[PDB]
Amino acid sequence: NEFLTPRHIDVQVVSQTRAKITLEPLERGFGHTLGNALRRILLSSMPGCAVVEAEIDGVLHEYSAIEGVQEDVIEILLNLKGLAIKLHGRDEVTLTLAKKGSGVVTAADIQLDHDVEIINGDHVIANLADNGALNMKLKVARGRGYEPADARSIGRLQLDASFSPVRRVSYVVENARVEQRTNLDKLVLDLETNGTLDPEEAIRRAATILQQQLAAF
Amino acid sequence: NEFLTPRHIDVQVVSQTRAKITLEPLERGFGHTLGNALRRILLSSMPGCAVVEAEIDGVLHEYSAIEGVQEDVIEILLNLKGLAIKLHGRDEVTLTLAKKGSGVVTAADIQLDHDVEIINGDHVIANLADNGALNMKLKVARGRGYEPADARRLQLDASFSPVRRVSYVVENARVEQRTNLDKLVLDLETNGTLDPEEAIRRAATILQQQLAAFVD
Amino acid sequence: VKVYLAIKRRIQPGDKMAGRHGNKGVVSVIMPVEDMPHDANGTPVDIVL
Amino acid sequence: ARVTVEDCLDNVDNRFELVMLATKRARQLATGGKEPKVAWENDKPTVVALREIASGLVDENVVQQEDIVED
Amino acid sequence: DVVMGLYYMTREAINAKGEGMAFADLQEVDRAYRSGQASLHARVKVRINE
Amino acid sequence: ELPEVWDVLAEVIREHPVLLNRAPTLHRLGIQAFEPVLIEGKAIQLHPLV
Amino acid sequence: ERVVQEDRFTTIHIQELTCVARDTKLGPEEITADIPNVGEAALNKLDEAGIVYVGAEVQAGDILVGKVTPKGETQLTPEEKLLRAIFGEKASDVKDTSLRVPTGTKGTVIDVQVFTRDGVERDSRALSIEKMQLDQIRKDLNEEF
Amino acid sequence: MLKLADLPESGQMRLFDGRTGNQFERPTTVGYMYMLKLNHLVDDKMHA
């Protein structure tokens, strides 16, 4: 018959997270078969960046603690899994961190790079004191989903990385009108991420995954 | 990186109007994304033709019986909902049925135009036990999917979608690299207007024509 | 000579979980986040009893 | 397919001679090089021996006659 | 757990969505239920071939 | 654990049944035979009806 | 899967594995670093004393400490000595009884304790652990004053 | 306290199916329950 092809991208950015988008007026009945399909693609596989290995020049294993700091090595590595890192033209970089004195080590203390961008700068990593300091190297990579260290000289500390920028996806279906038909609906995605990827670029990336799985059909 | 491209494993031809396709190589959570999207399009968004109104002579409502036919009016309206009509010229045409028989009334006895094509040529509509005549008037149109008579002069339920029963089961496919990969086993049952393998290629094309502007 | 080994055991299908009201059980499957039932806001549940 | 344990046990109705009749036939299909009367549907000789019982191709006197020709 | 799903499915209600409609076969019943235009338990009349 | 060993293990258990029994064997149905399939994990997947 | 990616119900288990050295009537048992019929991939994790380093990832089947026992009157089979000449391995009169981890268990060595007799000979690692303990007590007394 | 946090006093809300997208035809009891992990792991139970 006749179908109205949705060709529009209306993104309402209120903050770095929770970006509400509205694709276009869909056909009658395509609000749920296309909205639930896009939700199962975003929450499943979206490229992200995560720290896969951290090397500290003072500690051997993640269980033994270091002097001068307050958080344990396990607590320090668990704080690295909440970093929002964005890579532009590289697939695997190597960051470093070195701070002394009685200062709260945050995500902004990492050495700046041209192809590395950190969204969260107030993320507390560790708390130091006048007794000692810490110095470590960070290695991030590109991935698609959850990959533990078991499925992936003695100072190498591997971490279970989760390459998923999306956190919560919800969709509602309302009524639309283009002065052409009577029964037309629009789709509104309440996409919420960690601020790494663009919400307008996530829809074009999710539409390509669905189209590639149907081209071979 | 990127995903894996699926390939058609086997398509069963157990019946002329019933098939069973299989898609073995799939990702973790893709057996229900592609299975539910295609199951919802084939039942709700599929252009076709069906009978939407039946005007019989000497009939007031759907409960009053008539003399001349061994069956009641409700039995005749159920036989009209299974008629496979496929017209190409116009969009809304009216067909007339007039036959004074005594042993059998076949759906092929309806007069046809130069554009209306009926697939079921041996479908039984009614059985004229008495010597009375049976003259009615059928109205066909085009719709999107299954539309009952409650929405939108005997109004009957219209089934425009050519499929009749669409189901799918997703089980794990054994791969030496990873066992968590699943397979999609979809089986259709069309009314005879088109092949069951051609209905999926036409349903997957509708799903591609929507997000084609943003696809890179 | 005695050594000490540290093992970090995650939760897998087969482990026994329980509550404080005498309701024990064994985890059977670990479903993805997209399969779990969610509310209107999109918040998925963690455990289905 | 063609895996029916109740169809082969419907003719004998003993469930004890069927295990004995299928045992003497399963060894012939595994040892000695006897070709089965049914086609190889990628099944083990233990299961493909039960198809000949349900289809009625082999019997008590058929297995004894096929083994006597080899000796 | 299995007898709970078979009891709720076959549980006649007085007034429900899609009550009183007629179906030509069992395949039209599933086609009407999957579209959300008929309740899981509503008084209907369906022609059956047994 | 070479990759070619998994193709061999899948062929030696195709039509080979295994016996499953619970510790308290009160009646005859305490021991039943099943056709094993290869699953990922360390727990034996049992049928809900048995 | 959220309760697994977020490391909710993950727990840490500490396992102790001890290796004792007795005095066999044929010869005493000593902790060494030479093992017969092994390779470099099995001796790289050990040290000059014969014990693995603290913090080394040990898989299933790795050698933790080195321990060999002297053997006598082995009575080797003549069909076996022909096979040893194929590669060229020398004949050693020492049975391999090193401490290894059980099958299916993997972890990280976090602590190694060494105990010896009063006045017995100590290896190189015995004084290395002693030096670390003598400094942590000294660092505590300096902080007290 | 349920009506203080803008929650239904019945404690039940209508959920959506994650796989099919359809809404459940009956309200479902949701909430937060304290769970425990017992020392009966399968790493010491699987034998062969």
From Swiss-Prot, chain A:
Protein name as it appears in the record: DNA-directed RNA polymerase subunit alpha
Signal peptide: none
Quaternary data: Homodimer. The RNAP catalytic core consists of 2 alpha, 1 beta, 1 beta' and 1 omega subunit. When a sigma factor is associated with the core the holoenzyme is formed, which can initiate transcription.
Notes on the domains: The N-terminal domain is essential for RNAP assembly and basal transcription, whereas the C-terminal domain is involved in interaction with transcriptional regulators and with upstream promoter elements.
Biological role stated in the UniProt entry: DNA-dependent RNA polymerase catalyzes the transcription of DNA into RNA using the four ribonucleoside triphosphates as substrates.
GO molecular function terms attached to this record: DNA binding; DNA-directed RNA polymerase activity; protein dimerization activity
Family: Belongs to the RNA polymerase alpha chain family.
Curated annotation (Swiss-Prot), chain D:
Catalytic reaction list: RNA(n) + a ribonucleoside 5'-triphosphate = RNA(n+1) + diphosphate
Keywords annotated in UniProt: DNA-directed RNA polymerase, Nucleotidyltransferase, Transcription, Transferase
Coiled coil: none
Source organism, top-level taxon: Bacteria
EC number per UniProt: 2.7.7.6
GO CC aspect terms: cytosolic DNA-directed RNA polymerase complex
Disulfide pairings: none
GO biological process: DNA-templated transcription initiation
GO molecular function, one term: DNA-directed RNA polymerase activity
Enzyme class: transferase
Family per record: Belongs to the RNA polymerase subunit omega family.
Known partners and oligomeric status: The RNAP catalytic core consists of 2 alpha, 1 beta, 1 beta' and 1 omega subunit. When a sigma factor is associated with the core the holoenzyme is formed, which can initiate transcription.
Function summary: Promotes RNA polymerase assembly. Latches the N- and C-terminal regions of the beta' subunit thereby facilitating its interaction with the beta and alpha subunits.
Protein name per its UniProtKB record: DNA-directed RNA polymerase subunit omega
Swiss-Prot record, chain E:
Lineage, opening ranks: Bacteria, Pseudomonadati, Pseudomonadota, Gammaproteobacteria, Pseudomonadales
Residues shown, of full length: 505 to 554 of 1399
Role of this protein: DNA-dependent RNA polymerase catalyzes the transcription of DNA into RNA using the four ribonucleoside triphosphates as substrates.
Organism the protein comes from: Pseudomonas aeruginosa (strain ATCC 15692 / DSM 22644 / CIP 104116 / JCM 14847 / LMG 12228 / 1C / PRS 101 / PAO1)
Stated name of the protein: DNA-directed RNA polymerase subunit beta'
Quaternary organization: The RNAP catalytic core consists of 2 alpha, 1 beta, 1 beta' and 1 omega subunit. When a sigma factor is associated with the core the holoenzyme is formed, which can initiate transcription.
Family the UniProt entry places it in: Belongs to the RNA polymerase beta' chain family.
Swiss-Prot record, chain H:
Highest taxon of source: Bacteria
Reported function: DNA-dependent RNA polymerase catalyzes the transcription of DNA into RNA using the four ribonucleoside triphosphates as substrates.
Family, per entry: Belongs to the RNA polymerase beta chain family.
Oligomer status and interactors: The RNAP catalytic core consists of 2 alpha, 1 beta, 1 beta' and 1 omega subunit. When a sigma factor is associated with the core the holoenzyme is formed, which can initiate transcription.
The protein, known as: DNA-directed RNA polymerase subunit beta
Annotated source species: Pseudomonas aeruginosa (strain ATCC 15692 / DSM 22644 / CIP 104116 / JCM 14847 / LMG 12228 / 1C / PRS 101 / PAO1)
Gene designation: rpoB
